[PDB]
């Protein structure tokens, strides 16, 4: 029974879908416009209309609306009609998966390590709340600004990403904070490869036997062995042997302090974090919310 004041019930008359942004396995993402009651103003919003109980949907949506963390997208409004529409703050930059693909071999080491830090802080918040995401992947990490990423779609899996799933989840539908750690390792791998698809050319049916044999995702060319060992540690068979989100925040923050020693990127001395001037601009314009300082190179 969380705070019902975090979820605003929207009527079909207060909003309108205008543009198409993309679509995934759960639904289609639209750029929306909210017209608040008794007002003339049009306010951009992001709307996800689902693909396929009202009391039960709302119960889950209140939990989804209670996630208050700088690296977790909070559900803001819901519109229950014949379809289920979810409303959240519009993010022009979209997902990190497409951002890294559209910026292939053009992303600095400071960005990658800081994103790994931020994703770990978002998941660590979810673990403190005893919440399991179940669908962590670079497609479910949104870019607020290039220096601020946030985990999206928490609770959508509750209402199959085999290549992002831990073996116990594939075999026994078991989902814990430690299976989320496995998915996180796969997500870090997607970033380090600038958007590569994991186990490309391998049918989803073969993955469980491939894992049981001891096969894992290859070392991305930019990762030193210390970075690869952390990703490997995330894919251990024994869930309790895998690192904690708590430990991943510290390890990746320590690595962000010496970026060149942990990632080998060509043209990296040029690709630095933005000047205070450009970060002040981005913040006042599109990121007023309070977040921890991005880890700088000593
Ligand atoms: C690579 C894919 C991509 O570019 N995007 C995926 C995506 N989803 C959403 C989104 C998510 C949600 C949402 C958030 C919390 C809980 C439940 C839930 F459905 C939503 F309501 C609406 N959109 N976006 C998105 C796009 C633009 N601004 C914000 N979110 C993307 C982008």
From Swiss-Prot:
Phenotype upon changing residue 85 to R: Found in a lung cancer sample
PTM-bearing positions, type N6-(2-hydroxyisobutyryl)lysine: 48
Consequence of changing residue 9 to A: Abolishes phosphorylation
Outcome, altering residue 22 to C: Found in a lung cancer sample
Modified residues (Phosphotyrosine): 282
Record note on what altering residue 48 to A/M does: Abolishes kinase activity
Effect of residue 22 to S: Found in a lung cancer sample; somatic mutation; strongly increased kinase activity; constitutively activated kinase with higher levels of basal autophosphorylation; more sensitive to gefitinib than wild-type
UniProt tissue specificity: Ubiquitously expressed. Isoform 2 is also expressed in ovarian cancers.
Domain (Protein kinase): residue spans on this chain: 15-263
Annotated phenotype, changing residue 3 to A: Abolishes phosphorylation
Coiled-coil ranges per UniProt: none
GO cellular component: basal plasma membrane; basolateral plasma membrane; cell junction; cell surface; ciliary basal body; cilium; clathrin-coated endocytic vesicle membrane; cytoplasm
Post-translational modification: Phosphorylated on Tyr residues in response to EGF. Dephosphorylation by PTPRJ prevents endocytosis and stabilizes the receptor at the plasma membrane. Dephosphorylated by PTPN1 and PTPN2. Monoubiquitinated and polyubiquitinated upon EGF stimulation; which does not affect tyrosine kinase activity or signaling capacity but may play a role in lysosomal targeting. Polyubiquitin linkage is mainly through 'Lys-63', but linkage through 'Lys-48', 'Lys-11' and 'Lys-29' also occurs. Deubiquitination by OTUD7B prevents degradation. Ubiquitinated by RNF115 and RNF126. Ubiquitinated by ZNRF1 or CBL at different lysines in response to EGF stimulation; leading to recruitment of the ESCRT machinery and subsequent degradation in the lysosomes.
Residues binding ATP: 21-29, 48, 88-89, 153
Disease entry from the Swiss-Prot or TrEMBL record: Lung cancer: A common malignancy affecting tissues of the lung. The most common form of lung cancer is non-small cell lung cancer (NSCLC) that can be divided into 3 major histologic subtypes: squamous cell carcinoma, adenocarcinoma, and large cell lung cancer. NSCLC is often diagnosed at an advanced stage and has a poor prognosis.
UniProt-recorded name of the protein: Epidermal growth factor receptor
Species for this entry: Homo sapiens (Human)
Full-sequence portion shown in this chain: 698 to 1014 of 1210
